[PDB]
């Protein structure tokens, strides 16, 4: 059957997951694919600055920081982000998604770090001589009407 839950709320109890360490990641993706569960923080009694998997997430947000700077370089220059038309091919619906392996993701954090350093070099070269462009390009303008 199916409860409608428009005259009253939906009746619901809480449920535990004794998750293994081997598949700690791989089982948790599936809930995110499913999208019906809300968790309760028992770890809130412990402080927020020191937690278990901070060494992991702290590494990733710095890696996710850098991707916004890749998009920023697209903004300045005459380029468009070639985008997808729909979101039906990323397993957002009921269909499942096998999670990536560590080698897929270890390459990403690696690809974030060595890639930008090439881009930080090329933009310094441009800016080192682009400031030379405007200082002289103005110097001729006063001469044209001299």
Partner 1 sequence: MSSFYTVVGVFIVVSAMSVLFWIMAPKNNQAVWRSTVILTLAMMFLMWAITFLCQLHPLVAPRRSDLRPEF
Partner 2 sequence: LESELYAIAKELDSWFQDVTREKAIFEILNKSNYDTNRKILIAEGWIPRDELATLQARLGEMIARLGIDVPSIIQVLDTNHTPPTFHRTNKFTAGFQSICDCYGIAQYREINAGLPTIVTFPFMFAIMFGDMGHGFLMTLAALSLVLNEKKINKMKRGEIFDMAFTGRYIILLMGVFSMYTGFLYNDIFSKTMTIFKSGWKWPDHWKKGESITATSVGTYPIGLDWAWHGTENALLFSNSYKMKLSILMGFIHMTYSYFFSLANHLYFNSMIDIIGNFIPGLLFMQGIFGYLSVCIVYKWAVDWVKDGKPAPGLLNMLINMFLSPGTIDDELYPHQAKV
- Write down the least CB distance from residue 76 to partner 2, Å: 10
Nearer to partner 2, 53 or 139 (CB): 53
Of 4-23, binders to partner 1 (CB under 8 A) are 4, 6-7
Nearer to partner 2, 96 or 141 (CB): 96
Q: Are 3 and 10 in contact (CB under 8 A)?
A: yes
Residue 130 token pair:
């682009």
b/e per residue 116-133 (b: at least 16 CB within 10 A): eeeeeeeeeeeeeeeeee
Residue 121 token pair:
């070099």
Considering only 3-11, 42-50, 120-128, 136-144, which stretch makes contact with partner 1 by CB under 8 A? 3-11
Q: Does 78 bind partner 1 (CB under 8 A)?
A: no
Give the interface size with partner 1 as a residue count (CB under 8 A): 3
Residue 68 token pair:
């916004």
Q: How far apart are the C-alpha atoms of 130 and 126, rounded to whole Å?
A: 6
Q: Does 125 bind partner 1 (CB under 8 A)?
A: no
How open is the CA angle 128-129-135, to the nearest 5 degrees?
Answer: 110
Nearer to partner 1, 6 or 142 (CB): 6
Nearer to partner 1, 2 or 40 (CB): 2
Alpha-carbon Rg for the chain in angstroms: 25
Per CB under 8 A, residues contacting partner 1 are 4, 6-7
């Amino acid at each position: 059957e199916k409860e409608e839950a428009i005259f009253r709320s939906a009746e619901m109890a809480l449920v535990q997951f004794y998750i293994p360490q081997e598949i700690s990641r791989d089982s948790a993706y599936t809930l995110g694919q499913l999208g019906l569960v809300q968790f309760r923080d028992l770890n809130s009694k412990v402080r927020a600055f020191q937690r278990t998997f901070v060494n992991e997430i702290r590494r990733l947000d710095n890696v996710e920081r850098q991707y916004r700077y890749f998009y920023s370089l697209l903004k300045k220059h005459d380029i468009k982000l070639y985008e997808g038309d729909t979101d039906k091919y990323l397993d957002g619906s009921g269909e499942l998604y096998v999670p990536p392996s560590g080698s897929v993701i270890d390459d990403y954090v690696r690809n974030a770090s060595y890639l930008e350093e090439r881009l930080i070099q090329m933009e310094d070269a441009t800016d080192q001589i682009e400031v030379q462009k405007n200082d002289l390009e103005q110097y001729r303008f006063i001469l044209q009407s001299g």
